[PDB]
Design a protein around this ligand. Sequence first.
Ligand code: HEM
Ligand code: HEM
Lengths: 191, 191
Amino acid sequence: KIPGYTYGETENRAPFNLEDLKLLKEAVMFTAEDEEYIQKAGEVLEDQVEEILDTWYGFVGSHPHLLYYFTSPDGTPNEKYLAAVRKRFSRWILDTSNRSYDQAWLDYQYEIGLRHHRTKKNQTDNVESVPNIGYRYLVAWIYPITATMKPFLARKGHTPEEVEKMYQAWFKATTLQVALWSYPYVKYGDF
Amino acid sequence: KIPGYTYGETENRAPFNLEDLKLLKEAVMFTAEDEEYIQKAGEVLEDQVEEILDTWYGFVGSHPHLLYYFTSPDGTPNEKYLAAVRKRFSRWILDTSNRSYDQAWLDYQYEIGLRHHRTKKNQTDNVESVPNIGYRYLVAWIYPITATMKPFLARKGHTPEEVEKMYQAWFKATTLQVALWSYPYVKYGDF
Ligand code: HEM
Ligand code: HEM
């Protein structure tokens, strides 16, 4: 059990459906081939999820304007917030790799969007923190979340081009999701 | 002259400044090393800019829901629109490589955002087309605009490690810009 992790039990239907997903997957050049390799990436990443998260949390920790989004109103880091989110963030690596991308998947993407946005931020862990994460930074994180992953994908001794195929799947999957999470941020009708 | 290309003469000020850019550059892990390598990418790409646009326009052309954003009301591609945008799109490759990322640069990023958004779309070329490019697809394009560039960066005979450095600079620069272009799409206060 992971506190706050409500995959498959959301209680809002995403405003996007499988037809939206098909066309967005096309925009990001994700095909049947990538499903194979994202799943392959999951087998490779399963044991390293703690290292990856340390890398990501280290990036957060070293940037005051990034750590800021986890802070209590007095500017100090909320330790409980960081730790609770970490378990769901870590699980997300595996969900990205293992889940079928169906309507339950989409409904969670919407939920994750809401949690970054002022709509639901700080509700999941019942914490008091900054109200909203500026959208500029979710798009910006496509880079670190994609690029810092690559080394971990090579850690099971796979062939240069196999690593490359897992990386590309990961790059597309990260981009695809961030695009979906923009929904609560974007003016109604502009998404 | 490039019709509709108003870099340095937008006479609207960006709602983001150099301090915002510093913090966004940090989010995207863009440093002085990347300024060197983005500049080097420009030298490599200068000669290849038409074949690059052929590739991107080839992607647009094979997906009806993408070609869509360049269509006249009858659903056929507006040829005047594609051709005029192609010149500004091709110049943007070199601007990304060659310009100082200063307030003049930021002001144009804001203009480019306005041009994909319903605020200014179709005004520059005085064309009749669809009102808005769904923001979901700008984020999504981070993938093809980044990944399809990579082979072009290798055509000047550079080593794979130098190509890798130009490619990483290009990936960060693309992500960085798309993040900025979200401004007119994001609910005020949520960017
Ligand atoms: C590629 C971009 C990003 C990815 C892949 C990502 C991933 C995630 C995931 C998987 C969760 C947990 C979702 C759940 O509750 O199940 C989460 C929540 C969270 N993330 Fe992000 N995120 C991104 C952008 C950012 C940025 C830029 C920040 C700023 C530091 C950030 C800070 C946070 C915070 C504070 C939460 C907890 C939100 C809440 O109160 O529920 N994230 N993120
Ligand atoms: C990484 C994402 C993208 C990049 C780097 C990019 C780049 C550009 C550039 C440089 C221009 C010309 C700007 C100027 O006026 O000087 C432009 C305009 C345009 N682009 Fe994009 N673009 C992206 C996303 C998209 C998407 C997803 C579409 C959908 C097909 C699209 C279609 C168009 C259209 C229709 C225009 C003309 C807008 C107008 O009427 O002024 N772009 N883009």
